[PDB]
Ligand binder design. Structure first.
Ligand SMILES: Nc1ncnc2c1ncn2[C@@H]1O[C@H](COP(=O)(O)OP(=O)(O)OP(=O)(O)O)[C@@H](O)[C@H]1O
Ligand SMILES: Nc1ncnc2c1ncn2[C@@H]1O[C@H](COP(=O)(O)OP(=O)(O)OP(=O)(O)O)[C@@H](O)[C@H]1O
Ligand SMILES: Cc1cn([C@H]2C[C@H](O)[C@@H](COP(=O)(O)OP(=O)(O)OP(=O)(O)O)O2)c(=O)[nH]c1=O
Ligand SMILES: [Mg+2]
Ligand SMILES: [Mg+2]
Ligand SMILES: [Mn+2]
Ligand SMILES: [Mn+2]
Ligand SMILES: [Mn+2]
Ligand SMILES: [Mn+2]
Lengths: 683, 289, 289, 683
């Protein structure tokens, strides 16, 4: 066993009844003085390194050609001047195993952390040396972390796409289904997770040109998509991951759910395609009143009204659907469907739950389209227009397929540096650059939506780490007050940066004029309610930083009205799974699953303590499963009120609790304004 | 979670000895040296003798003590394959390659052989020690069974696979490959039944069962090394056979949900070429807060 | 003089229920009265129970005590057929024709039915009373097994055969005929083994064994009458089925080398109407013409 | 039990030790007196019937509008003047259950046999009343039978395409694979059987964008295609049928074959995807000499030579591939592979066998392309060019995808009417019309090849029926003499009609000038070998008909040289599954499987004796399984020497014969010039 492995395992060997957390630090030293420094490839100077990486097809030469070598040297020197040290063994291990650039045979390390950060910063700046240094300082301080696609692939010749998630709308036609399968394979080839809205597809037993009971429903398309994602599995490196979203009022909703039952037959079971359910407020109202609900056949509704079932408001059209004899429907028990959802989430963690009305009551771009589904991580909530892929030799009507670039603020590092504004603006600029340089030649709706919406996702990580390292319980009202203030600041500065980009470029996102940003409605709660901290401890935490007031929000509203906004969507809180290790941060705004996690790598086992875990903050690092899910819902709703897109909200459940407890948590989330629920992980 | 799936895989792998014509092996058998013919005969008898124990005792005893109708059916099917298919197949190979008197002598020799007997009796001892309603003794026997199916057979399988990978004794090699494919799934299945018992135990009891499994593996492994030299030194193959034993020991451990014991090694390319939360109804007032 | 030919017959009769598509019975099933469907489900459930115990217990235990690897191979194969093929086929039929709740209810019904519990108690009791090296306890269990194979199944078999003979439920009926074809040879084989043991006895001992066999048959018969009435009165067939079970009781006695006990009667003529490839290598001469 | 069913089951009841065959005739009468006439919709006049069928969207207005009502009435009167009577119950049952037009509620019969024949004739003639009457006389004499798609769908508004055999070339790219899946779905939606060539696809473990061990091989593509064919199943009417062809020198050939093994896992086996193997002469030579063969990685060959492995002649390329270090290959035993093919055919009848050199040594259009694969029925053998389907908003390079037009001559009816020439020419005209009226808007290469090649398949059926009713054993040399003469006349008149159509329209098929028709090579064996019958009995059979001599063939060769040929391909012998029942004929040129076949419809049993079966010809109606497969191969080769495309050739084996016998039959077929082997049906 390696020396650093033994040093890391020495953490759990208690001394005087206490964990040896400091041993972890020793491990990193070993991991660098025995493995990383020996396995790294050193050159005489930076010029030889850059030339070797360029000619050997490791780096794209275009982004490096925008800078003179003196500027690149200055950027690299700025990166190395911080003398960044990984405080935990797992941070360095995760970076050098998942994100550091290696040779073709993967026998040596070509990229250090500073090298990777410098390359990403130079790609972000697009020829601006000062901007590149700003990005270097932002990432080496670990205030901002680009998503895994962006951080791993920026400036690389053998790179994939920098966009993490893609959302596709599938129209009710064989041509559209085949095009959706093709685009899903193309985007999984690019490495991104693909989500498909199957609510427009007509249910099982519908007519294909006057021959009835002919359609296979959404389950056949689900099987096709599952095989497509199995085939396109990132060249066999990462399993192809897809998501299917169906409205709960679709007739196939049961069969949909039956794809995830552990007793499902092979002709129905789907195993590589995640499932999500979109629940309008009408379904929750029907379940609450115990009135029997009706699921609908989408094609009959489309024939009668000319629009898809998910294209209009069910809260106002459900009674018209039910009373219409030309609309076909089936009777269901909404409470039984809710119990089935809870049982399925207990068994397998599926489906994702999207509260459609919670998303669309604060959605700023309802004029473009209502949000009808979410992404594979159930945090992207954007307007999408379905595409009409016609026959060959016929022009296709290209719609809008959602796609946003992810980037997370490290809350602990951002607040320690007292740089919410600067970090938010620089992250917005980096995400705007990632969107601008993204061009996908096989997904036309994705390309058009990227060019028009200009949507980005700016997330946050290390919420629980910051709260526990500052002596604040994650479930406490003080923690929710901190989240309210911090994310109001993040939203304020993201809107300010979006408006500044719109002013400097003279262009807004497409159809911005009909948005609530243009009409000023979006700023209502910000121009009437003060989001400054209500607790003295939180206010002290925010000292040295100008917390925006109602007057600052009014000025920002006027600025947006004058100049517009460059981005249709700005903030989305992704799960941030593996890149949180490198940043020494807790995953996303979720509470920690465990204080010390035991992970098996190779034939060895490693223990990763939570960042900053110690004796004095052991009980502030409360495990998520031990927490009240209602207070976690309260925290997520408090954050969500300042996030325009959704938050990947994983439910952390105990084995003792029943499906009724899961249903109660889901209904409280819906009541509190939670937009989406990601996972039901049971301990 | 797994018995119906294994049922399917087992029954779809059904085969009979008569399907492979054996006589064409005599066209390569006649060209082997005395040491090659001797090793082959001895290996074959070793496999035959061990597989008979599995058919008469190993599978039926496990089927007897395991609860569950579907598991008993799968286990019965596996016992059938040992007694009705595998045993007849080994006999057929022997009758094709050697005259009656030679077969009787080889079995007399292998029956007296110290290394074959040591492992055969160690395994049988654990089957005989199973006690009614005692899941610990059942687990120990399952470990023994997995070690036979997924590990002990492979010092023997090596040689037919070695010939099969070279284009020699292709008919009997095809038969051996079908047998081996059955033993692989038998080992995986019994392994899952053992893990089920293991997972029902306390942490101290688990550590104790792990020590049992590793200790047993060590005893069998040290005897396999001696068995290997005894048979394969005369044909110069022992080094490569030892690598194959360790590789298969690791598979057996993985079948029991344990970590590999031996470092990863490459295998001879000729042999490679041959190879539910409680449902509680919503009570209303759960929609109001 | 017989095991090899039984071995060959058993293995050549190998089948799986999945070979028979059952969706063709959907309409003739839908068309039966509620009484008819109820009797049919219950009849097959009673059969499932018998095969469950014959596969789990009866055949494996007899295999354990009978000497000779070939005899054991036949008995092991028969055991596999009981629980891996026969018992499972009934679930294939149930899953096609009936909704889950009706399936759940009929399996609950077997657990609480007093005649089905009594017959299982009696047969399994005799299986579990076998003592090692005690041929008399073994004989008694073999008599019980013959009575299960050749007599007890027939109160159940009547109804699928009765429908098959009218051109109704013919796919399910095809499965049942395959099961019946197997049980007929199973009853003969076990009968021959029982006769072997009986023939070793003194005349005095033989007289006692005949008493045992006849007393057991009468006890099982009286219970089967009540079972038959309970199932068939609602479909009007009890008297007809009773004639059929007496007919088959005589066949069971004959399988045991005993004279028929019941007088001959006319059986419903409807029920009477209800009754890999070999591989060679390619020679160089096969490429020229 | 209905009266006609009792009269049909009375056949098996033996009177005086003989089957009551004549009772079948009575059954037909009952089937018309009790059922057909009662459930047939009658109208006061044909005008009312046509108006009702057109208005209720049963027929098409376009093809009926080309004639005055007087001409349509005259065509219908010509059809009804024959007073055609079905000779067997199964003929009428199959027509009125499969082909007769029924109401939307499927309880009444709108079309009789004469009505359907008249409608198909009017569709064929395209406005010519005399041509329509000629077609009516052709089909009511039952001399020619349009295929099931053409016969069922001609003149019907609610219909699929008239072509049901489609051959697709799949290029080695994800875009091309997705396009192939889409086209397969679209063509299965149209009701056609789709065959895909997978030899150009790179094998498992190949590089994608210079990353190693990334390709899933052709098995993942087969899984995708199998899912696509399961999804597209003719609106839930028939099971989606597809075929995949792989060259035997493709490395995936074993895994390909492993998709049909019973022991294959669920992630390996494809259930609704037929498989065929293309066997070049090089593989047969390697197996014959027992030399170990090599299966090649297609992408390495493409990188080294710039052409696909299946696009070059393996006979001259195999040694260069083996000796090339940059071409990756795996060692195999060709005899073991042949034994595996025989074993798989014994178990399941798969794969289809295509002898590439047997096809291409007589292929007339090798300049366009060599025949690389066959159809789902393994009788279509045409040149195909792969298409380069690029990314979106990029022009695709459309190639040639085979789609031939099926139609079968009834040999008994054709020869008893002494009308080989007239029937062949009229069938060629009808096939040309159906090919010209086919327009598929979702298969670009299929449409392009239909427009360019103008390929049709004119088959024959009732060969064994005709031979048995004339006292000729199917295995006798007299039967082969008759087949030789009859199919040489069929080829002669097909070529003459193609040249006449080319002269009339002034156009040939694309790239005809490079064909062997243009160079006169095709006619070589016809201008030197006389194909007149060598037996007096066969000559008396051909009495009253002019048999083309060598001088006639020289004149035809000169005519083709002067005027060209309209069709790239003319003759292909399809299995003719259900149309053989309606025509009261034996299926294809195959020998009969059973003298009397027992079928189960609903809960009733039915008995179909072979047409013309009696006590006198009971011995001549020998069953196919009892026949010597070598003599069947000899007859099929005798026919194949006059057929430009292939013949659906099913092997009929007994359970006693082993895989050595199957391999011997396959090797004798290869030796005798058999192009394709369809199925290995074991009795
Ligand atoms: N935790 C760590 N994170 C990142 N790099 C590390 C870490 N520990 C060691 N290294 C690398 O290994 C080298 C070993 O030097 P070390 O940290 O022991 O101190 P040093 O030799 O006094 O110099 P310095 O600390 O100034 O780099 C470091 O210079 C650095 O490049
Ligand atoms: N074998 C058959 N094939 C086809 N149609 C038949 C057959 N038998 C009877 N029919 C149909 O039933 C009708 C009655 O025929 P039948 O044998 O009674 O005498 P017919 O002289 O042909 O009668 P019609 O006055 O109808 O012409 C036929 O006209 C035809 O429409
Ligand atoms: C072709 C086909 C379609 N479908 C379903 C899936 C699609 O969402 C739906 C629409 O198919 P379409 O491609 O729209 O079929 P269509 O346009 O010819 O019919 P229509 O005019 O009614 O739109 O039909 C199947 O389920 N199976 C099939 O094989
Ligand atoms: Mg449509
Ligand atoms: Mg390519
Ligand atoms: Mn065995
Ligand atoms: Mn075994
Ligand atoms: Mn049984
Ligand atoms: Mn039995």
């Amino acid at each position: 066993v390696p020396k650093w492995i033994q040093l890391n395992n020495e953490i759990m060997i208690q001394k005087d009844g206490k964990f040896q957390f400091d041993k972890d630090k020793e491990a990193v030293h070993s991991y660098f003085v025995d493995y990383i420094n020996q396995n790294t490839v050193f050159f005489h100077n930076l010029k030889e390194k850059l030339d070797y990486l360029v000619e050997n097809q490791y780096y794209e030469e275009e982004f490096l050609s925008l800078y003179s070598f003196e500027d690149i040297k200055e950027v690299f020197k700025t990166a190395y001047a911080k003398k960044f040290r990984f405080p935990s063994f797992m941070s360095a291990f995760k970076f050098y195993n998942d994100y550091a650039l290696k040779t073709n045979d993967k026998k040596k390390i070509l990229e250090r952390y500073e090298d990777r950060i410098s390359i990403v910063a130079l790609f972000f700046a697009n020829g601006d040396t000062e901007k590149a240094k700003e990005y270097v300082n932002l990432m080496i301080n670990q205030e901002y972390q680009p998503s895994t696609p962006t951080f791993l692939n920026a400036g690389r010749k053998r790179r994939g796409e920098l966009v993490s998630c893609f959302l596709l709308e599938v129209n009710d036609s064989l041509n559209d289904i085949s095009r959706a399968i093709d685009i899903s394979m193309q985007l999984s080839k690019l490495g991104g997770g693909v989500s498909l809205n199957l609510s427009k597809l007509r249910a099982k037993g519908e007519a294909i040109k006057d021959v009835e009971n002919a359609t296979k429903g959404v389950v056949g398309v689900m099987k096709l998509l599952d095989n497509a994602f199995r085939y396109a599995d990132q060249m066999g490196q990462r399993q192809g991951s897809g998501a299917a979203y169906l409205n709960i009022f679709h007739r196939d909703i049961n069969d949909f759910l039956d794809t995830k039952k552990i007793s499902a037959d092979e002709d129905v079971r789907v195993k590589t395609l995640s499932i999500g359910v979109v629940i309008p407020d009408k379904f929750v109202e029907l379940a609450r009143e115990d009135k029997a609900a009706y699921v609908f056949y989408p094609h009959t509704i489309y024939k009668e009204y000319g629009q898809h079932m998910d294209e209009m408001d069910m809260n106002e059209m459900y009674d018209k659907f039910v009373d219409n004899p030309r609309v076909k429907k089936e009777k269901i028990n909404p409470r039984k469907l809710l119990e089935k959802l809870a049982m399925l989430r207990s068994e397998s963690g599926y489906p994702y739950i999207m509260f459609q009305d919670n998303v669309n009551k604060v959605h700023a771009n309802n004029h473009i389209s209502k949000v009808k589904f979410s992404n594979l991580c159930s945090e992207v909530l954007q307007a999408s227009q379905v595409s009409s892929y016609t026959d060959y030799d016929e022009e296709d009507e290209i719609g809008l397929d959602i796609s946003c670039n992810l980037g997370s603020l490290n809350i602990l590092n951002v607040m320690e540096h007292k740089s919410i504004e600067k970090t938010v603006k620089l992250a917005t600029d980096s995400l705007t650059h990632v969107s601008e340089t993204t061009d996908i030649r096989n997904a036309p709706a994705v390309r058009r939506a990227n060019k028009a919406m200009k949507s980005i996702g700016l997330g946050a990580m290390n919420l629980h780490g910051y709260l526990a390292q500052n002596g604040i319980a994650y479930e406490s009202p003080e923690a929710r007050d901190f989240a309210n203030t911090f994310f109001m600041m993040v939203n304020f500065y993201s809107i300010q940066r979006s408006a500044e980009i719109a002013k400097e470029k003279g262009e807004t996102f497409d159809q911005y004029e009909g948005s609530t940003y243009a009409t000023g409605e979006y700023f209502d709660k910000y121009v009437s309610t003060d989001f400054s901290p209500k607790y003295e401890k939180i206010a002290n935490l925010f000292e040295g930083m100008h917390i925006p007031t109602t007057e600052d929000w009014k000025k920002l509203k006027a600025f947006v009205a004058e100049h517009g906004m460059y981005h249709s969507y700005r903030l989305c809180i992704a799960p941030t799974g593996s890149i949180s290790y490198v940043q020494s941060s807790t995953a996303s705004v979720m509470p920690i699953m465990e204080r010390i996690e035991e992970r098996t790598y190779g034939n060895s086992k490693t223990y990763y303590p939570m960042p900053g875990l110690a004796s004095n903050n052991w009980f502030f690092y409360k495990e998520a499963y031990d927490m009240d899910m209602f207070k976690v819902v309260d925290m997520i709703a408090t954050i969500q009120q300042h996030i325009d897109q959704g938050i990947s909200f994983t439910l952390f459940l105990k084995d003792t609790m029943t499906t009724r407890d899961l249903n109660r948590i889901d209904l409280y989330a819906h009541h509190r304004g939670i937009k989406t629920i990601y996972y039901a992980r049971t301990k | 979670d797994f018995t119906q799936m294994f049922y399917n895989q087992n029954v779809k792998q059904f085969w009979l000895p008569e399907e492979i014509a054996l006589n064409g092996d005599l066209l390569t058998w006649k060209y082997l040296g005395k040491n090659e013919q001797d090793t082959y005969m001895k290996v074959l008898a070793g496999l035959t003798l061990l597989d008979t124990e599995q058919g008469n005792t190993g599978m039926p005893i496990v089927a007897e003590h395991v609860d569950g109708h579907q598991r008993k059916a799968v286990l019965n099917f596996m016992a059938m394959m040992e007694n009705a298919v595998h045993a007849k197949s080994y006999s057929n190979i022997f009758m094709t390659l050697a005259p009656t008197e030679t077969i009787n002598e080889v079995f007399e020799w292998v029956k007296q052989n110290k290394y074959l007997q040591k492992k055969a009796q160690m395994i049988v001892g654990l089957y005989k020690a199973i006690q009614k309603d005692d899941e610990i003794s059942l687990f120990k026997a399952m470990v023994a069974s997995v070690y036979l199916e997924s590990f002990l057979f492979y010092s023997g399988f090596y040689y037919p696979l070695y010939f099969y990978g070279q284009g020699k004794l292709m008919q009997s090699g095809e038969i051996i490959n079908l047998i081996l494919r059955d033993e692989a799934i038998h080992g995986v299945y019994v392994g899952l039944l053992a893990q089920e018992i293991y997972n029902k135990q306390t942490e101290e009891k688990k550590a104790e069962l792990r020590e049992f499994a590793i200790d047993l593996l060590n005893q069998l492994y040290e005897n396999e090394l001696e068995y290997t030299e005894d048979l394969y030194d005369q044909v110069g193959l022992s080094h490569d056979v030892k690598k194959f034993i360790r590789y298969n020991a690791n598979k057996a451990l993985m079948n029991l949900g344990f970590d590999p014991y031996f470092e990863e090694e490459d295998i001879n390319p000729i042999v490679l070429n041959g190879l539910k939360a409680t449902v509680e109804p919503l009570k209303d007032d759960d929609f109001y807060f």
